[PDB]
Design a protein around this ligand. Structure first.
Ligand SMILES: Nc1ncnc2c1ncn2[C@@H]1O[C@H](COP(=O)(O)OP(=O)(O)O)[C@@H](O)[C@H]1O
Ligand SMILES: Nc1ncnc2c1ncn2[C@@H]1O[C@H](COP(=O)(O)OP(=O)(O)O)[C@@H](O)[C@H]1O
Ligand SMILES: Nc1ncnc2c1ncn2[C@@H]1O[C@H](COP(=O)(O)OP(=O)(O)O)[C@@H](O)[C@H]1O
Ligand SMILES: [Mg+2]
Ligand SMILES: [Mg+2]
Ligand SMILES: [Mg+2]
Lengths: 144, 96, 63, 44, 121, 518, 43, 75
């Protein structure tokens, strides 16, 4: 949203200089197309998994939020979340497998990756028989 | 040597707003900082930029400030497409 | 005056203080006046017959 | 040289394009402050 | 069928005019008013077509009084001949009759109104 | 007197006329900038819900803008039906209809000619124009290579004015390849427009097979090789039995538990009827409940639910099979086959991509862009291109574009202007100047001199040659056959016929009666 | 015929009709005040 | 158009409607040059300067002086 306004500021003075808008428009498309080729020469390839690059990249890319100073433990959390889904074809990894559950309470420092599937809803407690389960078999009922 | 080249000069001048905005947010003088961007880049072909912690110019690869190429690619690409659509507008007519 | 103001808009975006902007035009204005005072020629050496023509040069310019 | 081959009528597109550019840049000035590590947050 | 376009109107206008001076009475002015009322139709066609109503009305009255053939009317498209045998124009008798019947029967009702009360909405 | 009542505007013969002509001037000046390749797009701001619309089509501009003028409503309706018939050329109707009335305004005022006499000149002038347009056409479709090339030129000529003018070299292949895949079937419902945010305008790629925005079930696998496709307009939902009016009388709940057992056994036997064919996927029109969904797991059958009515025919024609609901006789209803049933992701929404089908009678145009206003322009642009190219399959004759069709039609009109006696010959020449005003406007939008190119084009075609045209890139006369600019014969025939009827309706007016609004 | 002059103007004859009816309206107001059988008008 | 007619009424006392209809028709004829042919406004007035100069020169030769005879001036 800032580079767009900057190029419009460039086109502002160019409209007074007797140049057509279509010539100004095609110049940016040709200039932008050349800009892609310059960065393709500059960018460096990386391995499938590299904690030195991915963790530092994730921490220095947030850079503006409240959890940027908490990124000492959340940047590995983001890298470890995506590395579980791996493919050689460079697929578009879907973020539906990475669910972000919002619970009001506590602090951000208590945030940590749960090993299993965390459920948002609470128990019914109409009868309240069991308290804590161990070695339980989970089933998904769809009927009533 | 064409009128298309004169537009590309303004394209290069307007693209320098990103380090200028970083200088104003950090409080540093933009011309003094941007003058160092010009002084170090003719020899340094890449990884030369601004670091906010030290408030100066240094090698960004040593300080670990990296980003994907697709982010900057989509920014330059989508920005040119938006200006292409805005400049083709001529009239603002009220409708239902 | 609008041309100085329009070009000053781009320099305010860069973060230059307005007094340094104003002092720059003051030094540039006197420098331009000092140069233009040297390059222009005098017409008092000519006689009255040619001095009338110089008024006709400016009279047609103003009308 | 002059008075030939054209005359630019309907300069309102030029006025409309200027109004759209300054309108887009004025919105960009509010978003410009949030750039970089030294940017700020916005409450809406 | 009949042949309209000003031919039936001028034919029916002079028929009542020739009987007006035979039956003077007191209603002769009503026969003359009925004659001049029929003439407004071909004069309207002459007005819309741009032709002169003086030459058009005088020609139809003078010609139709002389000759008995009653299929000559106002040529609006600007042809050189006014005889409608060649111009391919035909109208029904029931259609041209109802113009006179529904008109003369309405105007009796229009003339018999004296008191006119209009309740404002 | 006052018969019409209070708040009723009436006009008589000098306020009635010159209110429609200034309305024809008002509606024509808006769409003047949109005509041609260098035309500027108009932005429409709605009065409610802050809904904006970027659009170049003259019909869509007149759809949204309110116009209380009765004469402008005629131009609103003729652009609507022109968009319904051909889809392209609505702006040329509004411009040519307005300029015909602009010329006729001068013939009524300056020359003092009756309005009916002006129409009689336009009838003979329009007949001479269509006869020249018929003789100027050229046959096609005898060679498939030439028919392939002419559709590419028609797609380039159509998309030259829209937002795809820069990338028309790539979109011409995408536009013409989809039409040849229809196998003669003229219908636009078999082409889908999937909206995807991101990328650039030239990222639109041609899809092999058929792609749509649906999803598998909860337990279904990702990939199945050589999957048999079936389409059910069935109710795999709680079927009920259709003799509405069935209720269940229950004396004891012992048989009611066995009654519910029969309901589950009823649908089990229905899904068992599906497995007799041995299909690999199952496509249903409406929502599938969970109990049918669990039964497709062990049988190795994929599931797709909530398919649109258009999507049934769009997927069935690519599959080649027919929609089956009874599932009784496995002999008839031979199904198709698809190689790759693997889905892909373009943006944030997964789409089911198919490839390697029997037939491709239905297609799907994948688009990429920045703003939805550009995608809406991309939809309307290719809809006009695909509509023109689809009607070019049934109507084979075409005509050269680039403004040469307007001047070559006016040549026969000017030739027939001399031998017509009376005052209507000036109206015959007024029709010629109306055809000349279209290429005059093409030079104005491009920013070049209009009087020189129109004078050079007019003097060039009367010499004997009839292949010259306007080249707005260089700003001079050039050969249209070299550049490859050609348009359909029914398009320009509809434009001249619609514009002739447009001037005829508004020229036969003498009074305006505007009743009170509700 | 088609070559006849339409004259482009019906507003003049309509204004003359409005003036004649307006002039005949007041002329018919004082029609019954003529002759020995006339009537007085108190204003 | 009101002021040019007032000056013509005070100057000569005749020909005011001719100035009003001719000055409006010059702007009427100049309208299509601006719209259709796209002529500069400075070019339209520049032609009217040379056209008006030749116009008054036509009246210089087209006039006739009847001062030599009072009977012809009376006529
Ligand atoms: N081509 C023609 N030549 C001569 N007379 C005509 C021609 N066309 C129409 N008319 C006359 O003009 C009249 C017009 O009637 P018309 O306007 O069609 O019916 P209405 O008045 O109910 O609309 C007809 O009665 C006919 O006699
Ligand atoms: N590439 C081109 N070169 C020259 N003229 C063109 C070109 N493309 C289109 N035209 C002209 O533009 C005119 C109108 O184009 P059209 O596609 O109908 O625009 P719209 O859909 O806005 O009416 C046509 O008569 C044609 O001659
Ligand atoms: N009987 C006539 N024959 C020919 N021309 C006439 C006759 N009467 C008037 N004219 C012309 O009509 C014009 C009337 O102009 P006029 O109405 O006096 O202008 P204005 O009212 O503006 O002074 C004159 O130029 C004259 O040439
Ligand atoms: Mg970031
Ligand atoms: Mg088009
Ligand atoms: Mg006079």
């Amino acid at each position: 949203v800032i580079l767009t306004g900057a190029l419009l500021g460039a086109a502002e003075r160019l409209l007074n200089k007797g140049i057509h808008p279509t010539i100004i428009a095609d110049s940016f498309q040709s200039a932008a197309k050349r800009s892609v080729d310059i960065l393709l020469e500059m960018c460096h390839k990386v391995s499938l998994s590299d904690r030195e690059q991915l963790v530092r990249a994730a921490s220095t890319s947030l850079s503006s939020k409240i959890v940027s100073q908490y990124s000492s433990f959340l940047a590995p959390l983001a890298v470890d979340s995506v590395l579980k889904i791996s493919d050689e074809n460079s697929k578009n990894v879907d973020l539906n497998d990475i669910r972000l559950v919002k619970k009001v309470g506590g602090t951000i420092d208590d945030t940590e990756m749960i090993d299993g599937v965390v459920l948002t809803q609470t128990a019914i407690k109409s009868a309240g028989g069991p308290t804590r389960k161990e070695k339980a078999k989970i089933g998904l009922i769809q009927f009533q | 040597e064409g009128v298309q080249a004169f537009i590309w000069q303004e394209f290069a001048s307007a693209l320098e707003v990103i380090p200028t905005t970083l200088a104003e947010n950090a409080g540093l003088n933009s011309i003094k900082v941007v003058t160092e961007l010009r002084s170090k880049h003719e020899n340094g072909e890449l990884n030369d930029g601004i670091s906010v912690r030290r408030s100066g110019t240094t090698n960004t690869y040593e300080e670990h400030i990296l980003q994907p190429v697709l982010v900057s690619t989509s920014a330059i690409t989508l920005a040119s497409e938006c200006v292409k659509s805005i400049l083709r507008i001529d009239d603002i007519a009220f409708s239902r | 005056a609008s041309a100085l103001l329009d070009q000053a808009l781009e320099l305010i975006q860069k973060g230059i203080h307005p007094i340094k902007i104003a002092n720059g035009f003051d030094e540039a204005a006197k420098l331009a006046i000092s140069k233009l005072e040297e390059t222009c020629d005098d017409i008092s050496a000519s006689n009255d017959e040619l001095f009338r023509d110089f008024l006709l040069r400016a009279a047609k310019t103003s009308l | 040289v002059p008075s030939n081959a054209t005359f630019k009528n309907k300069e309102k597109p030029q006025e409309v394009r200027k109004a759209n550019i300054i309108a887009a840049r004025s919105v960009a000035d509010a978003i410009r402050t949030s750039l970089g590590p030294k940017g700020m947050d916005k409450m809406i | 069928v009949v042949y309209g376009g000003g031919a039936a109107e001028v034919t029916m206008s002079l028929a009542v005019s020739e009987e007006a001076d035979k039956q003077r009475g007191i209603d002769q002015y009503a026969f003359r008013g009925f004659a001049q009322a029929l003439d407004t139709i071909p004069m309207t066609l002459a007005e819309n077509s741009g032709l002169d109503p003086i030459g058009t009305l005088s020609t139809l009255k003078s010609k139709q009084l002389k000759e008995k053939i009653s299929n000559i009317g106002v040529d609006c498209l600007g042809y050189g001949s006014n005889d409608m045998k060649e111009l391919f124009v035909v109208d029904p008798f029931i259609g041209k009759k109802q113009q006179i019947l529904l008109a003369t029967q309405l105007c009796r009702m229009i003339l018999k109104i004296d008191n006119v009360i209009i309740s404002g909405k | 007197v006052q018969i019409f009542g209070d708040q009723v505007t009436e006009e008589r013969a000098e306020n009635a006329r010159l209110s429609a002509f200034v309305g024809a001037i008002a509606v024509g000046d808006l769409v003047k900038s949109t005509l041609g390749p260098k035309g500027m797009d108009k932005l429409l701001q709605s009065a409610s819900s802050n809904t904006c619309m970027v659009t170049n089509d003259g019909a869509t501009i007149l759809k949204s803008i309110p116009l209380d003028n009765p004469a402008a409503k005629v131009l609103v309706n003729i652009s609507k039906v022109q968009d319904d018939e051909v889809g392209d050329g609505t702006t040329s109707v509004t411009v040519l209809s307005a300029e015909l009335l602009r010329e006729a305004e001068k013939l009524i005022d300056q020359s003092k000619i009756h309005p009916q006499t002006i129409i009689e000149g336009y009838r003979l002038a329009s007949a001479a124009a269509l006869d020249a347009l018929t003789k100027a056409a050229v046959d096609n479709s005898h060679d498939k290579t030439m028919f392939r090339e002419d559709l590419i030129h028609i797609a380039k000529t159509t998309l030259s004015s829209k937002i795809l003018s820069q990338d028309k070299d790539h979109f011409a292949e995408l536009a013409t390849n989809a039409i040849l895949r229809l196998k003669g079937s003229t219908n636009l419902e078999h082409i889908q427009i999937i909206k995807i945010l991101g990328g650039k305008l030239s990222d639109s790629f041609l899809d092999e097979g058929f792609i749509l925005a649906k999803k598998f079930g909860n337990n279904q696998p990702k990939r199945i090789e050589n999957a048999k496709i079936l389409i059910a307009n069935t109710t795999l939902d709680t079927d009920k039995v259709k003799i509405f009016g069935t209720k269940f009388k229950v004396d004891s709940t012992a048989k009611l538990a066995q009654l519910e057992k029969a309901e589950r056994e009823k649908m089990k036997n229905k899904i068992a009827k599906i497995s007799k064919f041995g299909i690999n996927t199952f496509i249903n029109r409406q929502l599938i409940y969970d109990y049918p969904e669990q039964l497709f797991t062990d049988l190795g059958i994929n599931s797709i639910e909530h398919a649109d009515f258009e999507g049934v025919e769009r997927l069935a024609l690519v599959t080649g099979g027919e929609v089956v609901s009874t599932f009784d006789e496995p002999s008839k209803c031979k199904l198709g086959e698809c190689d790759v049933i693997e889905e892909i992701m373009l943006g944030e929404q997964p789409f089911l991509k198919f490839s390697g089908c029997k037939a491709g009678e239905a297609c799907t145009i994948v688009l990429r862009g920045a703003t939805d206003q550009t995608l809406d322009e991309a939809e309307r642009s290719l809809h006009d291109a695909l509509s023109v190219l689809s009607q070019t399959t049934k109507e084979t004759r075409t005509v050269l574009g680039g403004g040469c069709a307007e001047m070559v039609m006016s040549k026969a009109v000017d030739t027939e202007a001399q031998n017509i006696d009376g005052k209507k010959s000036l109206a015959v020449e007024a029709f010629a100047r109306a055809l000349r005003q279209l290429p005059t406007i093409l030079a104005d939008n491009a920013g070049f001199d209009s009087s020189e190119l129109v004078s050079k084009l007019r003097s060039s075609i009367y010499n004997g040659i009839s292949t010259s045209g306007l080249d707005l890139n260089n700003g001079t006369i050039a050969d249209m056959r070299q550049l490859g600019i050609v348009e359909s014969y029914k398009l320009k025939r509809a434009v001249v016929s619609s514009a002739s009827e447009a001037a005829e309706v508004l020229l036969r007016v003498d009074n305006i009666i505007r009743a009170r609004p509700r």
